[PDB]
Write a protein that binds this ligand. Structure first.
Ligand SMILES: CN(C)CC(=O)Nc1ccc2[nH]c(=O)c3ccccc3c2c1
Length: 213
């Protein structure tokens, strides 16, 4: 069960620096409805490079054994697309010093997994956070079949980290929010977010209920 199964009608979708081909907000609305019908729920945005986007959508979300041992390892997403937007690019530059813009993805999880999503009131960089999160999830870090949401730093927007096992149960489709080839390293323009996407982007109640501290 990968995002490729949930793209709806229309042509073949592909990721490009000039936007996701054959993807529109109207198509997203159909896809979203298909995912909801099958029991999935939207949990946030994931920004990544083009090739990674393609892998995630058509091959599925899989851990790639990166930063093993790091207690905060997992699949990073954000309810606010602006936070994800910053990571939507190639990591390493081209042969000629060009870093291409990436893509914004929408991440869906089976509804029955929602009880494993937790929120902290602490910032995740605070030295106390690891221990507070371990108390929420009931086991030592790293995250497993569970997720944590909290601020990245004080005042920061809130990131959600899915444990890799839980992330393997997600399905991911493209967002209709574009990235800008001129605005690599930059901030998302709020006005490029389609209103009709916003309307289907509410998060579950763990994300707004007071964080645990
Ligand atoms: C520099 N990055 C492209 C690679 C990386 O080091 N990690 C990583 C890589 C991709 C990421 N994409 C996300 O949407 C995101 C959202 C909230 C918080 C973190 C992330 C995120 C983090």
């Amino acid at each position: 069960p990968t995002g490729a199964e949930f793209l709806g009608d229309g042509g073949d979708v592909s990721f490009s620096t000039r936007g996701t081909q054959n993807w529109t907000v109207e198509r997203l609305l159909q896809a979203h409805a298909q995912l909801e019908e099958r029991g999935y729920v939207f949990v946030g945005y994931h920004g990544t490079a083009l090739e990674a986007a393609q892998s995630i959508v058509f091959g599925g979300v899989r851990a790639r054994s990166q930063d093993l041992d790091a207690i905060w390892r997992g699949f990073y997403i954000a309810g606010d697309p602006a936070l994800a937007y910053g990571y939507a690019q190639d990591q390493e530059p081209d042969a000629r010093g060009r870093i291409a813009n990436g893509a914004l993805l929408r991440v869906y999880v089976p509804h029955s997994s929602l009880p494993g999503f937790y929120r902290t009131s602490l910032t995740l960089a605070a030295p106390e956070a690891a221990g507070e999160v371990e108390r929420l999830i009931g086991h030592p870090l790293p995250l497993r079949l569970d997720a944590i949401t909290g601020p990245e730093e004080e005042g920061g927007r809130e990131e959600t980290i899915l444990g890799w096992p839980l992330a393997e149960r997600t399905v991911v489709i493209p967002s209709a929010i574009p990235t800008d080839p001129r605005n690599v390293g930059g901030d998302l323009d709020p006005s490029s977010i389609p209103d009709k996407e916003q309307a289907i982007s509410a998060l579950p109640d763990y994300a707004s209920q007071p964080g645990k501290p």
